[PDB]
């Protein structure tokens, strides 16, 4: 009887499928169910890719701990992070200009913004777990696809007002963020966050 009593075969063995939480369970869990991607379905990313012109702004560093701010620290951090990148490269009017004391939001969060090449118009291409940039004015292309983690941080609201903030922390020995400005380009996704190019048939590298 290979009907009533289950059926088939193949290897399977016992596995884990019931993990709640060490202490209290109130986190998000999106695994095999959702159906959305950057701007439009994965097809729009993995295929044509959603690329638009965006002024890349240095990098806002953050050495926050695992318990900053009496709430979340989303605002405080990004707010001081972006406003900080301006204190560095105020040439791009956003939060400050000329000069400003500033310091930090509230807790130990926030680190330091680097102003190597802030405010540089270029074509940013977003793809499923792979973001490649292209120097528009520089007349060249920027290759940077080492990390692919963009979920909670600053989709398109908690940042400052009219500035785009990004988060990148793959390993546990650095963790840094970057800033970007959308002059009627990527703004489509960075403003509303239609979705997120996240599929990857496999974890990531496993190497």
Curated annotation (Swiss-Prot):
Signal peptide: none annotated. Widely expressed. Expressed in neural stem cells but absent in mature neurons. It is found in: Cytoplasm; Cell junction, Focal adhesion. The modification Phosphoserine is found at residue 29. Phosphorylated by activated epidermal growth factor receptor. Phosphorylated in response to FLT4 and KIT signaling. Isoform p46Shc and isoform p52Shc are phosphorylated on tyrosine residues of the Pro-rich domain. Tyrosine phosphorylated in response to FLT3 signaling. Tyrosine phosphorylated by activated PTK2B/PYK2. Tyrosine phosphorylated by ligand-activated ALK. Tyrosine phosphorylated by ligand-activated PDGFRB. Tyrosine phosphorylated by TEK/TIE2. Residues 46-207 form the PID domain. The modification N6-acetyllysine is found at residue 44. Interacts with CPNE3; this interaction may mediate the binding of CPNE3 with ERBB2. Interacts with the NPXY motif of tyrosine-phosphorylated IGF1R and INSR in vitro via the PID domain. Once activated, binds to GRB2. Interacts with tyrosine-phosphorylated CD3T and DDR2. Interacts with the N-terminal region of SH2B2. Interacts with phosphorylated LRP1 and IRS4. Interacts with INPP5D/SHIP1 and INPPL1/SHIP2. Interacts with TRIM31. Interacts with PTPN6/SHP (tyrosine phosphorylated). Identified in a complex containing FGFR4, NCAM1, CDH2, PLCG1, FRS2, SRC, SHC1, GAP43 and CTT. In response to a variety of growth factors, isoform p46Shc and isoform p52Shc bind to phosphorylated Trk receptors through their phosphotyrosine binding (PID) and/or SH2 domains. The PID and SH2 domains bind to specific phosphorylated tyrosine residues in the Asn-Pro-Xaa-Tyr(P) motif of the Trk receptors. Isoform p46Shc and isoform p52Shc are in turn phosphorylated on three tyrosine residues within the extended proline-rich domain. These phosphotyrosines act as docking site for GRB2 and thereby are involved in Ras activation. Signaling adapter that couples activated growth factor receptors to signaling pathways. Participates in a signaling cascade initiated by activated KIT and KITLG/SCF. Isoform p46Shc and isoform p52Shc, once phosphorylated, couple activated receptor tyrosine kinases to Ras via the recruitment of the GRB2/SOS complex and are implicated in the cytoplasmic propagation of mitogenic signals. Isoform p46Shc and isoform p52Shc may thus function as initiators of the Ras signaling cascade in various non-neuronal systems. This is SHC-transforming protein 1. It comes from Homo sapiens. The lineage of its organism: Eukaryota, Metazoa, Chordata, Craniata, Vertebrata.
